Design a binder for this molecule. Structure first.
Ligand code: HEM
Ligand SMILES: [K+]
Length: 250
């Protein structure tokens, strides 16, 4: 694992458990799981291992980081969460947004991603430009997830299945529509649809398509399309790692 999780107080631990339950009801009612998942992923995916900059350290709430074009629309997510966060002043924003990401997966029917508290809020956003480009292919994915974040090729494929919930918006990225027929249900449908090719009303980004043609990504796509249990396992492993980049000695 390579992780040493810090100690937090009993009151901090109580606030986590209470916030997890409040976040479930809220995120379920507001129907905003995919947006919250996108928020935690964009917050965490700025980590660069060589410099140990970026990562899930609460800087995504900064107007400066929200302005990054890859984060178009995430100011909505931040705004939605601010009243709830105010009820848990003991929690770092880093912990709160990561926990909201975990919850987003859980309440849509997804795996139970393990959560460890202790992220401290960092003073300055990372540089813009570290997040992936939907028009690019497999070398780019490996640059971003592997060379920067330090994730594996398996992680890239499983985390891409994050697209099993939610949708693109032509006013945000310019892409438009859901990847799946059930955008509020977390399951292995992203991989099913990607394999079955194009279907009316359904989205596939070039970055999604790049997974089909890579000798390593493709068998993972196939495995996940065949076995949702194996997708859920690899997904929970990868999300945990992502949510913990630069935190607790990795
Ligand atoms: C593999 C590289 C990736 C690229 C190029 C990419 C790109 C995109 C784009 C362009 C959108 C639509 C933005 C919009 O117009 O609203 C989107 C949405 C989304 N992404 Fe990704 N993404 C990637 C990976 C991931 C990962 C790793 C996760 C989390 C595990 C994730 C979770 C989501 C979710 C849940 C949505 C829907 C947001 C909503 O419904 O509002 N994506 N992604
Ligand atoms: K789905």
């Amino acid at each position: 694992s390579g992780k040493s999780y810090p100690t937090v107080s009993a009151d901090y631990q109580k606030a986590v458990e209470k916030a997890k339950k409040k976040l479930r009801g809220f995120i379920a009612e507001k129907r905003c799981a995919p947006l919250m998942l996108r928020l935690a992923w964009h917050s965490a995916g700025t980590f660069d291992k060589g410099t140990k900059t970026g990562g899930p350290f609460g800087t995504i709430k900064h107007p400066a980081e929200l302005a990054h074009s890859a984060n178009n629309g995430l100011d909505i997510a931040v705004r939605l969460l601010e009243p709830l966060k105010a009820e848990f002043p003991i929690l770092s924003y880093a912990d709160f947004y990561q926990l909201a990401g975990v919850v987003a997966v859980e309440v849509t029917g997804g795996p139970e991603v393990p959560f460890h508290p202790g992220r401290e809020d960092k003073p300055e956003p990372p540089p813009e430009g570290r997040l992936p480009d939907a028009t690019k292919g497999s070398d780019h994915l490996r640059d971003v997830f592997g060379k920067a974040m330090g994730l594996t090729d398996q992680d890239i494929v499983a985390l891409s299945g994050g697209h099993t919930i939610g949708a693109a918006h032509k006013e945000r990225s310019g892409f438009e529509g859901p990847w799946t027929s059930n955008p509020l249900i977390f399951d292995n449908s992203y991989f099913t649809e990607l394999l079955s090719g194009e279907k009316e009303g359904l989205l596939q980004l070039p970055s999604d398509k790049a997974l089909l043609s890579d000798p390593v990504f493709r068998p993972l796509v196939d495995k996940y399309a065949a076995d949702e249990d194996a997708f859920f396992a690899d997904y929970a492993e990868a999300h945990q790692k992502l949510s913990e980049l630069g935190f607790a000695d990795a």
